[PDB]
Design a protein around this nucleic acid. Structure first.
Length: 478
DNA sequence: CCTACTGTGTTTGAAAATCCCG
RNA sequence: GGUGGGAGGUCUGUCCCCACCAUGGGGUGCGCGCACGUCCAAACGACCAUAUCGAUAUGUAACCAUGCAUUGGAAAGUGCAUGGAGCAGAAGAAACACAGUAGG
DNA sequence: CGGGATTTTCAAACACAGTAGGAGGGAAAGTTGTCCAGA
Protein backbone atom coordinates (compact mmCIF):
# COMPACT_ATOMS: atom_id res chain seq x y z
CA UNK A 1 0.00 0.00 0.00
CA UNK A 2 2.96 2.29 -0.77
CA UNK A 3 4.22 2.21 2.82
CA UNK A 4 7.11 4.30 4.10
CA UNK A 5 10.36 2.33 4.44
CA UNK A 6 13.34 3.63 6.40
CA UNK A 7 16.63 3.48 4.49
CA UNK A 8 20.17 4.40 5.52
CA UNK A 9 21.55 7.19 3.33
CA UNK A 10 25.11 8.40 2.91
CA UNK A 11 25.19 12.19 3.47
CA UNK A 12 21.87 13.95 4.02
CA UNK A 13 21.42 17.69 3.56
CA UNK A 14 18.33 19.11 5.26
CA UNK A 15 16.83 21.97 3.27
CA UNK A 16 15.18 24.60 5.47
CA UNK A 17 14.20 28.25 5.25
CA UNK A 18 15.58 30.47 8.00
CA UNK A 19 13.75 33.53 9.32
CA UNK A 20 16.53 35.87 10.48
CA UNK A 21 15.60 39.15 12.13
CA UNK A 22 17.09 42.08 10.15
CA UNK A 23 20.24 42.14 12.31
CA UNK A 24 20.84 38.42 11.71
CA UNK A 25 20.33 38.88 7.96
CA UNK A 26 22.77 41.81 8.04
CA UNK A 27 25.38 39.67 9.77
CA UNK A 28 24.88 36.79 7.31
CA UNK A 29 25.33 38.91 4.20
CA UNK A 30 28.28 40.70 5.81
CA UNK A 31 29.82 37.25 6.25
CA UNK A 32 29.14 36.54 2.57
CA UNK A 33 30.93 39.81 1.77
CA UNK A 34 33.83 38.79 4.01
CA UNK A 35 34.20 35.48 2.17
CA UNK A 36 34.09 37.24 -1.20
CA UNK A 37 36.73 39.73 -0.06
CA UNK A 38 38.98 36.90 1.13
CA UNK A 39 38.50 35.19 -2.24
CA UNK A 40 39.30 38.39 -4.15
CA UNK A 41 42.25 39.48 -2.01
CA UNK A 42 43.87 36.04 -2.08
CA UNK A 43 43.40 35.44 -5.79
CA UNK A 44 44.41 39.00 -6.68
CA UNK A 45 47.54 38.58 -4.56
CA UNK A 46 48.40 35.26 -6.21
CA UNK A 47 48.85 37.12 -9.50
CA UNK A 48 51.26 39.61 -7.89
CA UNK A 49 53.35 36.60 -6.78
CA UNK A 50 53.22 37.32 -3.06
CA UNK A 51 55.61 35.01 -1.15
CA UNK A 52 53.12 34.62 1.71
CA UNK A 53 50.58 32.74 -0.44
CA UNK A 54 52.63 31.10 -3.19
CA UNK A 55 53.74 27.55 -2.44
CA UNK A 56 57.21 26.07 -2.69
CA UNK A 57 58.80 27.11 -6.01
CA UNK A 58 59.72 24.08 -8.08
CA UNK A 59 63.13 23.29 -9.55
CA UNK A 60 61.92 24.59 -12.93
CA UNK A 61 61.30 28.06 -11.48
CA UNK A 62 57.52 27.72 -11.63
CA UNK A 63 55.47 29.03 -8.70
CA UNK A 64 52.17 27.45 -7.67
CA UNK A 65 49.68 28.25 -4.91
CA UNK A 66 49.76 25.45 -2.33
CA UNK A 67 46.56 25.39 -0.32
CA UNK A 68 48.06 24.23 2.98
CA UNK A 69 50.16 27.40 3.20
CA UNK A 70 47.01 29.44 2.60
CA UNK A 71 44.98 28.47 5.72
CA UNK A 72 46.95 29.78 8.72
CA UNK A 73 46.38 32.57 11.24
CA UNK A 74 49.13 34.81 9.84
CA UNK A 75 47.30 35.15 6.52
CA UNK A 76 44.02 36.10 8.21
CA UNK A 77 45.81 38.63 10.43
CA UNK A 78 47.49 40.17 7.39
CA UNK A 79 44.03 40.36 5.81
CA UNK A 80 42.56 42.08 8.87
CA UNK A 81 45.57 44.43 8.84
CA UNK A 82 44.76 45.48 5.27
CA UNK A 83 41.02 46.01 5.82
CA UNK A 84 38.64 45.62 8.78
CA UNK A 85 35.75 44.14 6.74
CA UNK A 86 37.41 40.72 6.43
CA UNK A 87 37.51 39.18 9.93
CA UNK A 88 33.69 39.04 10.14
CA UNK A 89 33.86 35.75 8.28
CA UNK A 90 33.91 32.70 10.57
CA UNK A 91 37.39 31.31 11.08
CA UNK A 92 36.06 27.82 10.38
CA UNK A 93 34.40 29.11 7.19
CA UNK A 94 37.78 29.99 5.65
CA UNK A 95 40.42 27.49 6.79
CA UNK A 96 38.53 24.22 7.30
CA UNK A 97 38.29 21.33 4.85
CA UNK A 98 34.75 22.45 3.89
CA UNK A 99 35.39 26.19 3.96
CA UNK A 100 36.53 28.88 1.52
CA UNK A 101 39.94 27.60 0.49
CA UNK A 102 40.04 23.80 0.53
CA UNK A 103 36.55 23.52 -0.96
CA UNK A 104 35.99 26.49 -3.29
CA UNK A 105 39.36 27.97 -4.22
CA UNK A 106 40.78 24.48 -4.75
CA UNK A 107 38.08 23.43 -7.21
CA UNK A 108 38.13 26.86 -8.87
CA UNK A 109 41.86 26.82 -9.60
CA UNK A 110 41.67 23.14 -10.55
CA UNK A 111 38.90 23.75 -13.10
CA UNK A 112 38.91 27.34 -14.38
CA UNK A 113 42.67 27.87 -14.51
CA UNK A 114 43.47 24.27 -15.46
CA UNK A 115 45.77 23.83 -12.43
CA UNK A 116 48.45 26.04 -13.97
CA UNK A 117 51.01 28.05 -11.96
CA UNK A 118 50.30 31.68 -11.17
CA UNK A 119 53.24 32.82 -13.32
CA UNK A 120 51.93 31.07 -16.46
CA UNK A 121 48.16 31.07 -15.94
CA UNK A 122 46.15 33.97 -17.34
CA UNK A 123 44.05 36.35 -15.26
CA UNK A 124 41.23 37.65 -17.46
CA UNK A 125 39.85 34.12 -17.98
CA UNK A 126 39.32 33.60 -14.22
CA UNK A 127 36.07 34.83 -12.68
CA UNK A 128 36.25 36.58 -9.31
CA UNK A 129 33.48 37.62 -6.90
CA UNK A 130 31.65 40.87 -7.66
CA UNK A 131 28.12 42.18 -8.18
CA UNK A 132 27.76 39.53 -10.91
CA UNK A 133 28.59 36.55 -8.65
CA UNK A 134 28.53 37.34 -4.92
CA UNK A 135 29.42 34.64 -2.41
CA UNK A 136 26.32 32.49 -1.79
CA UNK A 137 27.49 30.27 1.11
CA UNK A 138 29.51 29.86 4.27
CA UNK A 139 29.96 26.53 6.08
CA UNK A 140 30.42 26.96 9.83
CA UNK A 141 30.65 23.98 12.20
CA UNK A 142 28.12 24.01 15.05
CA UNK A 143 27.16 21.64 17.85
CA UNK A 144 23.66 20.15 18.11
CA UNK A 145 23.31 22.30 21.24
CA UNK A 146 22.75 25.17 18.78
CA UNK A 147 20.24 23.04 16.82
CA UNK A 148 17.17 22.99 19.08
CA UNK A 149 13.84 21.88 17.56
CA UNK A 150 10.36 22.79 18.76
CA UNK A 151 8.01 20.17 20.21
CA UNK A 152 4.79 22.20 20.27
CA UNK A 153 5.16 22.17 16.50
CA UNK A 154 6.64 19.31 14.47
CA UNK A 155 8.52 21.20 11.74
CA UNK A 156 10.23 24.21 13.37
CA UNK A 157 13.71 24.64 14.87
CA UNK A 158 15.89 27.12 16.72
CA UNK A 159 19.31 27.54 15.10
CA UNK A 160 21.90 29.94 16.51
CA UNK A 161 24.98 30.15 14.29
CA UNK A 162 28.51 31.11 15.41
CA UNK A 163 29.27 34.83 15.74
CA UNK A 164 25.52 35.63 15.48
CA UNK A 165 22.93 36.21 18.20
CA UNK A 166 19.23 35.47 18.27
CA UNK A 167 18.69 31.74 17.59
CA UNK A 168 17.44 32.15 14.02
CA UNK A 169 14.12 30.34 13.57
CA UNK A 170 14.37 27.60 10.96
CA UNK A 171 11.26 26.03 9.43
CA UNK A 172 10.30 22.76 7.85
CA UNK A 173 12.15 19.78 9.25
CA UNK A 174 12.34 16.71 7.05
CA UNK A 175 10.92 14.75 9.97
CA UNK A 176 10.87 11.58 7.90
CA UNK A 177 14.56 11.28 8.86
CA UNK A 178 15.25 9.04 11.85
CA UNK A 179 18.34 8.82 14.05
CA UNK A 180 19.96 6.09 16.11
CA UNK A 181 21.14 2.66 14.99
CA UNK A 182 17.78 1.42 13.66
CA UNK A 183 16.15 4.78 12.92
CA UNK A 184 13.77 4.77 15.89
CA UNK A 185 14.68 8.08 17.58
CA UNK A 186 13.65 11.67 17.03
CA UNK A 187 16.26 14.42 16.99
CA UNK A 188 15.93 15.20 20.70
CA UNK A 189 16.27 11.52 21.63
CA UNK A 190 19.51 11.09 19.67
CA UNK A 191 20.87 14.39 20.97
CA UNK A 192 20.16 13.22 24.53
CA UNK A 193 21.38 9.67 23.85
CA UNK A 194 24.64 10.91 22.25
CA UNK A 195 24.56 9.12 18.90
CA UNK A 196 25.21 12.27 16.85
CA UNK A 197 28.15 14.29 15.56
CA UNK A 198 29.56 17.24 17.47
CA UNK A 199 30.59 19.75 14.77
CA UNK A 200 27.83 19.79 12.15
CA UNK A 201 28.15 21.61 8.82
CA UNK A 202 25.45 24.16 8.01
CA UNK A 203 25.98 25.66 4.56
CA UNK A 204 23.94 28.85 4.82
CA UNK A 205 23.19 29.72 1.18
CA UNK A 206 21.09 32.75 0.26
CA UNK A 207 19.03 32.42 -2.92
CA UNK A 208 18.61 34.99 -5.70
CA UNK A 209 15.88 36.82 -3.83
CA UNK A 210 16.41 37.30 -0.14
CA UNK A 211 15.60 33.79 1.09
CA UNK A 212 18.10 32.75 3.74
CA UNK A 213 18.14 29.02 3.14
CA UNK A 214 20.23 26.84 5.43
CA UNK A 215 21.55 23.34 4.79
CA UNK A 216 22.20 21.42 8.00
CA UNK A 217 24.28 18.74 6.34
CA UNK A 218 24.90 15.34 7.92
CA UNK A 219 27.57 12.79 7.06
CA UNK A 220 29.25 9.47 7.78
CA UNK A 221 32.74 10.81 8.39
CA UNK A 222 34.48 7.45 8.78
CA UNK A 223 32.88 4.18 7.68
CA UNK A 224 35.84 1.94 8.56
CA UNK A 225 34.73 -1.61 7.88
CA UNK A 226 30.98 -1.28 7.40
CA UNK A 227 29.63 0.68 10.38
CA UNK A 228 29.74 4.45 9.75
CA UNK A 229 30.94 6.83 12.44
CA UNK A 230 27.34 8.09 12.63
CA UNK A 231 24.05 6.40 11.80
CA UNK A 232 20.64 7.76 10.83
CA UNK A 233 17.75 6.64 8.64
CA UNK A 234 15.20 8.23 6.32
CA UNK A 235 11.81 6.82 5.32
CA UNK A 236 10.32 6.93 1.81
CA UNK A 237 7.34 5.10 0.35
CA UNK A 238 7.84 2.19 -2.06
CA UNK A 239 5.23 0.33 -4.07
CA UNK A 240 4.21 -3.00 -2.48
CA UNK A 241 5.00 -4.92 -5.68
CA UNK A 242 7.65 -3.13 -7.77
CA UNK A 243 8.20 -4.17 -11.38
CA UNK A 244 10.79 -3.26 -14.03
CA UNK A 245 9.93 0.06 -15.68
CA UNK A 246 10.98 1.64 -18.97
CA UNK A 247 10.53 5.38 -19.40
CA UNK A 248 9.90 7.41 -22.56
CA UNK A 249 9.69 11.15 -23.21
CA UNK A 250 7.67 12.85 -25.95
CA UNK A 251 7.46 16.36 -27.36
CA UNK A 252 3.97 16.87 -25.91
CA UNK A 253 4.88 14.97 -22.72
CA UNK A 254 7.51 15.04 -20.00
CA UNK A 255 7.57 11.30 -19.29
CA UNK A 256 5.79 8.13 -20.41
CA UNK A 257 6.18 4.84 -18.55
CA UNK A 258 6.00 1.33 -19.97
CA UNK A 259 3.08 0.63 -17.62
CA UNK A 260 0.89 3.06 -19.55
CA UNK A 261 0.82 6.18 -17.41
CA UNK A 262 1.67 9.47 -19.10
CA UNK A 263 2.85 12.70 -17.47
CA UNK A 264 2.12 16.15 -18.89
CA UNK A 265 4.79 18.85 -18.99
CA UNK A 266 3.01 21.98 -17.79
CA UNK A 267 5.86 23.84 -19.53
CA UNK A 268 5.53 27.06 -17.55
CA UNK A 269 8.01 28.95 -19.74
CA UNK A 270 5.48 29.66 -22.49
CA UNK A 271 2.62 29.81 -19.96
CA UNK A 272 3.99 33.01 -18.39
CA UNK A 273 5.85 34.06 -21.55
CA UNK A 274 3.38 36.91 -22.09
CA UNK A 275 3.97 38.34 -18.61
CA UNK A 276 7.65 37.48 -19.12
CA UNK A 277 7.81 39.76 -22.15
CA UNK A 278 5.78 42.37 -20.25
CA UNK A 279 8.36 42.61 -17.48
CA UNK A 280 11.28 42.13 -19.89
CA UNK A 281 10.40 45.26 -21.84
CA UNK A 282 9.50 46.82 -18.49
CA UNK A 283 13.02 46.62 -17.06
CA UNK A 284 14.50 47.18 -20.53
CA UNK A 285 13.15 50.74 -20.20
CA UNK A 286 13.74 51.26 -16.46
CA UNK A 287 16.46 53.48 -14.95
CA UNK A 288 19.13 51.07 -13.71
CA UNK A 289 21.31 48.17 -14.85
CA UNK A 290 20.20 45.64 -17.49
CA UNK A 291 18.83 48.60 -19.46
CA UNK A 292 21.31 49.61 -22.22
CA UNK A 293 20.25 53.21 -21.40
CA UNK A 294 21.58 53.58 -17.84
CA UNK A 295 24.65 51.42 -18.07
CA UNK A 296 26.07 53.90 -20.57
CA UNK A 297 25.36 56.67 -18.05
CA UNK A 298 27.14 54.68 -15.34
CA UNK A 299 30.14 54.01 -17.60
CA UNK A 300 30.29 57.69 -18.57
CA UNK A 301 30.21 58.89 -14.96
CA UNK A 302 32.80 56.31 -13.88
CA UNK A 303 35.10 57.27 -16.78
CA UNK A 304 34.82 60.99 -16.04
CA UNK A 305 35.37 60.27 -12.34
CA UNK A 306 38.60 58.36 -12.96
CA UNK A 307 39.78 60.91 -15.55
CA UNK A 308 39.18 63.87 -13.24
CA UNK A 309 40.79 62.05 -10.31
CA UNK A 310 43.89 61.36 -12.42
CA UNK A 311 43.99 64.94 -13.72
CA UNK A 312 43.53 66.39 -10.22
CA UNK A 313 45.84 64.14 -8.18
CA UNK A 314 49.14 64.46 -10.05
CA UNK A 315 48.73 67.76 -11.98
CA UNK A 316 47.13 69.44 -8.95
CA UNK A 317 49.72 67.88 -6.59
CA UNK A 318 47.00 67.52 -3.89
CA UNK A 319 48.71 70.15 -1.76
CA UNK A 320 45.88 71.51 0.39
CA UNK A 321 42.80 72.23 -1.72
CA UNK A 322 43.82 72.18 -5.40
CA UNK A 323 41.01 72.23 -7.99
CA UNK A 324 37.80 70.65 -6.58
CA UNK A 325 37.67 66.82 -6.67
CA UNK A 326 34.05 65.71 -7.03
CA UNK A 327 33.06 62.04 -6.81
CA UNK A 328 29.24 62.05 -6.39
CA UNK A 329 28.04 58.43 -6.79
CA UNK A 330 27.90 55.60 -9.33
CA UNK A 331 24.06 55.75 -9.23
CA UNK A 332 21.69 52.96 -8.14
CA UNK A 333 18.72 51.17 -9.71
CA UNK A 334 15.44 52.87 -8.88
CA UNK A 335 12.79 51.50 -6.51
CA UNK A 336 10.23 51.17 -9.31
CA UNK A 337 12.87 49.19 -11.18
CA UNK A 338 13.72 47.45 -7.90
CA UNK A 339 10.14 46.32 -7.25
CA UNK A 340 9.73 45.00 -10.79
CA UNK A 341 13.16 43.34 -10.65
CA UNK A 342 12.21 41.62 -7.39
CA UNK A 343 8.79 40.59 -8.74
CA UNK A 344 10.25 39.15 -11.94
CA UNK A 345 12.96 37.36 -9.94
CA UNK A 346 10.25 35.91 -7.72
CA UNK A 347 8.51 34.82 -10.92
CA UNK A 348 11.47 32.92 -12.39
CA UNK A 349 11.95 31.46 -8.91
CA UNK A 350 8.26 30.51 -8.99
CA UNK A 351 8.61 28.55 -12.24
CA UNK A 352 11.86 27.11 -10.87
CA UNK A 353 10.06 25.89 -7.74
CA UNK A 354 6.96 24.70 -9.61
CA UNK A 355 9.05 22.73 -12.11
CA UNK A 356 11.35 21.44 -9.37
CA UNK A 357 8.48 20.22 -7.19
CA UNK A 358 6.70 18.70 -10.20
CA UNK A 359 9.80 16.72 -11.17
CA UNK A 360 10.36 15.80 -7.51
CA UNK A 361 6.85 14.34 -7.35
CA UNK A 362 7.24 12.52 -10.68
CA UNK A 363 10.60 11.04 -9.70
CA UNK A 364 9.36 10.05 -6.24
CA UNK A 365 6.38 8.30 -7.81
CA UNK A 366 8.38 6.43 -10.46
CA UNK A 367 11.35 5.55 -8.23
CA UNK A 368 9.29 3.62 -5.68
CA UNK A 369 7.39 1.64 -8.30
CA UNK A 370 10.49 1.03 -10.45
CA UNK A 371 12.45 -1.98 -9.26
CA UNK A 372 14.59 -1.58 -12.40
CA UNK A 373 14.83 1.75 -14.21
CA UNK A 374 15.25 1.42 -17.98
CA UNK A 375 15.78 5.00 -19.10
CA UNK A 376 17.73 5.49 -22.31
CA UNK A 377 20.38 8.09 -21.48
CA UNK A 378 21.90 9.86 -18.48
CA UNK A 379 22.69 13.03 -20.48
CA UNK A 380 20.74 15.52 -22.58
CA UNK A 381 23.39 15.91 -25.30
CA UNK A 382 22.19 12.62 -26.81
CA UNK A 383 18.62 13.98 -27.01
CA UNK A 384 19.42 17.27 -28.80
CA UNK A 385 20.94 15.74 -31.95
CA UNK A 386 17.68 15.61 -33.93
CA UNK A 387 16.77 19.20 -32.93
CA UNK A 388 13.13 18.13 -32.58
CA UNK A 389 13.34 17.70 -28.80
CA UNK A 390 15.60 20.74 -28.32
CA UNK A 391 12.70 23.16 -28.83
CA UNK A 392 10.87 21.66 -25.84
CA UNK A 393 13.78 20.60 -23.60
CA UNK A 394 15.13 24.15 -23.87
CA UNK A 395 12.09 25.27 -21.87
CA UNK A 396 11.95 22.07 -19.76
CA UNK A 397 15.41 21.45 -18.28
CA UNK A 398 15.56 17.67 -18.45
CA UNK A 399 19.07 17.36 -16.96
CA UNK A 400 17.59 18.22 -13.57
CA UNK A 401 15.18 15.34 -14.15
CA UNK A 402 18.18 13.13 -14.95
CA UNK A 403 19.86 14.12 -11.68
CA UNK A 404 16.68 13.62 -9.64
CA UNK A 405 16.21 10.13 -11.09
CA UNK A 406 19.88 9.44 -10.45
CA UNK A 407 19.85 10.20 -6.74
CA UNK A 408 16.35 8.84 -6.09
CA UNK A 409 17.32 5.56 -7.73
CA UNK A 410 20.40 5.41 -5.49
CA UNK A 411 18.80 5.72 -2.04
CA UNK A 412 16.85 2.51 -2.73
CA UNK A 413 19.75 1.18 -4.87
CA UNK A 414 17.31 1.06 -7.80
CA UNK A 415 19.42 0.23 -10.87
CA UNK A 416 19.46 2.79 -13.69
CA UNK A 417 20.68 1.06 -16.87
CA UNK A 418 21.43 3.41 -19.78
CA UNK A 419 21.79 2.46 -23.45
CA UNK A 420 22.84 4.37 -26.53
CA UNK A 421 20.27 6.22 -28.63
CA UNK A 422 21.04 4.42 -31.89
CA UNK A 423 18.89 1.27 -31.82
CA UNK A 424 15.86 0.89 -34.11
CA UNK A 425 13.53 1.60 -31.19
CA UNK A 426 10.81 3.13 -33.37
CA UNK A 427 11.15 0.65 -36.25
CA UNK A 428 10.82 -2.45 -34.08
CA UNK A 429 7.51 -3.69 -32.65
CA UNK A 430 6.49 -4.66 -29.14
CA UNK A 431 5.38 -8.17 -30.15
CA UNK A 432 7.80 -9.46 -32.80
CA UNK A 433 10.20 -6.54 -33.27
CA UNK A 434 9.56 -6.24 -37.01
CA UNK A 435 11.55 -3.33 -38.45
CA UNK A 436 9.45 -0.58 -40.05
CA UNK A 437 11.43 2.48 -41.23
CA UNK A 438 8.23 4.51 -41.67
CA UNK A 439 7.83 4.83 -37.88
CA UNK A 440 11.04 6.87 -37.55
CA UNK A 441 9.15 10.13 -38.12
CA UNK A 442 7.65 11.52 -34.92
CA UNK A 443 4.32 12.52 -36.49
CA UNK A 444 3.08 8.90 -36.57
CA UNK A 445 0.90 8.20 -33.52
CA UNK A 446 -1.05 5.08 -34.57
CA UNK A 447 0.32 2.47 -36.99
CA UNK A 448 -1.22 -1.00 -37.28
CA UNK A 449 1.60 -3.53 -37.60
CA UNK A 450 0.96 -5.78 -40.63
CA UNK A 451 1.78 -9.06 -38.88
CA UNK A 452 0.12 -9.20 -35.44
CA UNK A 453 0.25 -5.67 -33.98
CA UNK A 454 -1.86 -2.51 -33.83
CA UNK A 455 0.59 -0.17 -32.03
CA UNK A 456 -1.79 2.59 -30.96
CA UNK A 457 1.03 4.23 -28.97
CA UNK A 458 4.70 4.48 -29.93
CA UNK A 459 5.73 5.47 -26.39
CA UNK A 460 4.65 2.14 -24.89
CA UNK A 461 6.37 0.24 -27.71
CA UNK A 462 9.62 2.19 -27.31
CA UNK A 463 9.67 1.71 -23.53
CA UNK A 464 8.96 -2.00 -24.01
CA UNK A 465 11.87 -2.30 -26.44
CA UNK A 466 14.23 -0.42 -24.11
CA UNK A 467 13.22 -2.58 -21.14
CA UNK A 468 13.67 -5.75 -23.21
CA UNK A 469 17.13 -4.60 -24.31
CA UNK A 470 18.09 -3.80 -20.71
CA UNK A 471 16.94 -7.26 -19.62
CA UNK A 472 18.77 -8.94 -22.51
CA UNK A 473 22.09 -7.23 -21.77
CA UNK A 474 21.66 -8.38 -18.17
CA UNK A 475 20.97 -11.91 -19.44
CA UNK A 476 24.24 -11.97 -21.42
CA UNK A 477 27.00 -9.59 -20.38
CA UNK A 478 28.46 -7.45 -23.16
C1' DC B 1 25.69 44.50 -25.54
C1' DC B 2 24.39 43.30 -21.23
C1' DT B 3 21.65 39.83 -17.75
C1' DA B 4 20.05 34.81 -16.55
C1' DC B 5 18.71 29.44 -16.76
C1' DT B 6 21.31 25.44 -17.49
C1' DG B 7 24.48 21.15 -18.51
C1' DT B 8 28.34 18.69 -15.94
C1' DG B 9 31.66 17.48 -12.78
C1' DT B 10 33.05 17.44 -7.79
C1' DT B 11 32.21 17.16 -2.60
C1' DT B 12 29.73 16.41 2.29
C1' DG B 13 34.48 17.19 10.21
C1' DA B 14 37.20 15.64 14.65
C1' DA B 15 40.42 17.65 18.38
C1' DA B 16 43.74 19.86 21.06
C1' DA B 17 44.72 24.78 22.01
C1' DT B 18 43.54 29.44 22.88
C1' DC B 19 39.96 33.12 24.49
C1' DC B 20 36.37 36.01 26.74
C1' DC B 21 32.90 38.73 29.59
C1' DG B 22 29.50 36.69 34.22
C1' G C 1 -17.65 32.98 -10.25
C1' G C 2 -13.73 33.54 -12.60
C1' U C 3 -8.38 36.80 -13.60
C1' G C 4 -3.35 37.17 -11.78
C1' G C 5 -1.07 37.25 -6.56
C1' G C 6 0.80 37.03 -0.69
C1' A C 7 2.34 34.14 4.43
C1' G C 8 2.13 29.25 6.42
C1' G C 9 10.12 25.44 3.82
C1' U C 10 7.85 23.83 -2.02
C1' C C 11 3.33 22.30 -5.48
C1' U C 12 -2.22 21.26 -6.47
C1' G C 13 -7.37 23.14 -3.96
C1' U C 14 -9.44 25.36 0.45
C1' C C 15 -8.52 28.34 4.62
C1' C C 16 -7.07 34.11 5.65
C1' C C 17 -5.74 38.14 2.25
C1' C C 18 -4.42 41.71 -2.21
C1' A C 19 -6.04 44.80 -7.20
C1' C C 20 -9.91 43.62 -11.63
C1' C C 21 -14.28 41.04 -15.97
C1' A C 22 -19.48 39.67 -16.34
C1' U C 23 -24.03 40.75 -15.17
C1' G C 24 -24.30 39.81 -21.71
C1' G C 25 -24.47 37.07 -26.11
C1' G C 26 -25.53 32.83 -27.91
C1' G C 27 -25.67 26.62 -30.60
C1' U C 28 -30.22 22.43 -28.22
C1' G C 29 -34.19 21.05 -24.75
C1' C C 30 -38.26 21.71 -20.92
C1' G C 31 -42.44 24.24 -19.40
C1' C C 32 -40.91 34.64 -19.53
C1' G C 33 -37.90 31.31 -16.30
C1' C C 34 -34.76 27.01 -15.93
C1' A C 35 -30.63 25.45 -18.19
C1' C C 36 -28.26 19.19 -19.47
C1' G C 37 -21.94 19.98 -21.38
C1' U C 38 -19.76 23.76 -23.30
C1' C C 39 -17.57 28.84 -26.00
C1' C C 40 -16.73 33.90 -26.46
C1' A C 41 -15.91 39.38 -24.07
C1' A C 42 -12.92 40.20 -20.46
C1' A C 43 -9.62 40.69 -15.79
C1' C C 44 -2.25 38.74 -16.15
C1' G C 45 2.95 40.61 -10.73
C1' A C 46 -1.03 45.73 -8.73
C1' C C 47 -4.29 49.81 -8.28
C1' C C 48 -4.20 54.83 -7.07
C1' A C 49 -2.20 59.91 -6.60
C1' U C 50 1.95 63.26 -7.99
C1' A C 51 4.95 65.90 -12.01
C1' U C 52 7.07 65.63 -17.02
C1' C C 53 7.96 63.24 -21.01
C1' G C 54 1.70 54.75 -22.20
C1' A C 55 5.63 55.53 -19.16
C1' U C 56 9.64 57.40 -16.36
C1' A C 57 10.12 58.18 -11.44
C1' U C 58 8.19 58.41 -6.27
C1' G C 59 4.33 57.03 -1.20
C1' U C 60 2.93 52.43 -1.59
C1' A C 61 -0.48 44.77 -0.51
C1' A C 62 -1.49 40.61 0.23
C1' C C 63 -2.12 35.25 7.67
C1' C C 64 -2.90 35.38 13.27
C1' A C 65 -1.24 36.73 18.43
C1' U C 66 1.79 39.63 22.43
C1' G C 67 4.72 43.74 24.00
C1' C C 68 7.08 48.77 23.07
C1' A C 69 7.08 54.01 20.93
C1' U C 70 3.82 56.67 17.53
C1' U C 71 -0.52 58.31 14.71
C1' G C 72 -5.23 58.21 17.47
C1' G C 73 -10.94 61.36 22.40
C1' A C 74 -12.06 57.24 19.32
C1' A C 75 -12.28 52.90 15.77
C1' A C 76 -8.11 51.18 13.77
C1' G C 77 -3.37 51.71 11.88
C1' U C 78 2.31 53.24 11.40
C1' G C 79 7.26 51.75 12.85
C1' C C 80 10.13 48.38 16.15
C1' A C 81 10.96 43.93 19.29
C1' U C 82 9.25 39.13 19.16
C1' G C 83 6.14 34.81 18.92
C1' G C 84 2.51 31.49 16.33
C1' A C 85 1.03 30.00 11.51
C1' G C 86 -2.80 24.84 9.30
C1' C C 87 -6.25 21.38 6.57
C1' A C 88 -7.13 17.03 2.26
C1' G C 89 -3.24 14.88 -1.29
C1' A C 90 1.78 15.08 -2.87
C1' A C 91 6.73 15.14 -2.41
C1' G C 92 11.20 17.27 0.64
C1' A C 93 20.06 16.45 -1.47
C1' A C 94 21.83 20.18 -1.23
C1' A C 95 26.34 23.58 -1.83
C1' C C 96 30.51 24.94 -5.08
C1' A C 97 33.25 25.85 -10.14
C1' C C 98 33.42 26.16 -15.32
C1' A C 99 31.28 27.78 -19.84
C1' G C 100 28.20 27.89 -23.73
C1' U C 101 23.40 29.21 -24.38
C1' A C 102 18.39 32.09 -24.50
C1' G C 103 16.19 36.84 -23.66
C1' G C 104 15.59 41.85 -24.43
C1' DC D 1 38.98 33.06 37.46
C1' DG D 2 36.52 30.51 35.04
C1' DG D 3 33.85 26.97 31.88
C1' DG D 4 31.93 26.89 27.29
C1' DA D 5 32.98 29.11 22.41
C1' DT D 6 35.88 29.83 18.92
C1' DT D 7 39.60 28.14 16.31
C1' DT D 8 43.91 25.79 14.01
C1' DT D 9 45.62 20.80 12.23
C1' DC D 10 45.07 17.05 10.54
C1' DA D 11 46.54 16.99 5.27
C1' DA D 12 47.30 16.06 0.59
C1' DA D 13 50.16 20.57 -4.75
C1' DC D 14 49.54 20.63 -8.93
C1' DA D 15 45.56 19.05 -15.85
C1' DC D 16 44.01 21.38 -21.36
C1' DA D 17 45.19 19.42 -25.74
C1' DG D 18 44.70 16.98 -28.47
C1' DT D 19 41.56 15.58 -34.47
C1' DA D 20 38.27 13.87 -37.83
C1' DG D 21 33.57 12.21 -39.93
C1' DG D 22 30.79 8.91 -38.50
C1' DA D 23 23.69 9.79 -37.99
C1' DG D 24 17.78 12.21 -38.85
C1' DG D 25 12.84 16.16 -38.55
C1' DG D 26 12.30 20.08 -37.22
C1' DA D 27 11.47 23.71 -40.08
C1' DA D 28 9.17 30.04 -43.33
C1' DA D 29 10.42 34.02 -43.94
C1' DG D 30 8.81 39.09 -46.91
C1' DT D 31 1.57 43.20 -46.11
C1' DT D 32 -1.15 46.84 -45.03
C1' DG D 33 -5.56 47.05 -41.50
C1' DT D 34 -6.61 47.50 -35.68
C1' DC D 35 -4.09 48.74 -32.48
C1' DC D 36 0.73 48.85 -30.70
C1' DA D 37 5.18 50.86 -28.69
C1' DG D 38 7.55 54.59 -27.67
C1' DA D 39 6.68 58.86 -29.17
Amino acid sequence: SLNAKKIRLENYAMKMRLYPSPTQAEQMDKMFLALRLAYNMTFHEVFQQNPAVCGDPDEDGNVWPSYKKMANKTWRKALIDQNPAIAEAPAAAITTNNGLFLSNGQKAWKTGMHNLPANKADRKDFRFYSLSKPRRSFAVQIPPDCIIPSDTNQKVARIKLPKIDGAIKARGFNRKIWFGPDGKHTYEEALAAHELSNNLTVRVSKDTCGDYFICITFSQGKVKGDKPTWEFYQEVRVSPIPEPIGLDVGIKDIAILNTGTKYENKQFKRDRAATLKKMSRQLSRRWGPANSAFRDYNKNIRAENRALEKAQQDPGSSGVGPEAPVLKSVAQPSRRYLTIQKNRAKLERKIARRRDTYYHQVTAEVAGKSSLLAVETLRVKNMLQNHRLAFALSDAAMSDFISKLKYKARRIQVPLVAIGTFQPSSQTCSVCGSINPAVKNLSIRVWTCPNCGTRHNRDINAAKNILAIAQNMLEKKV
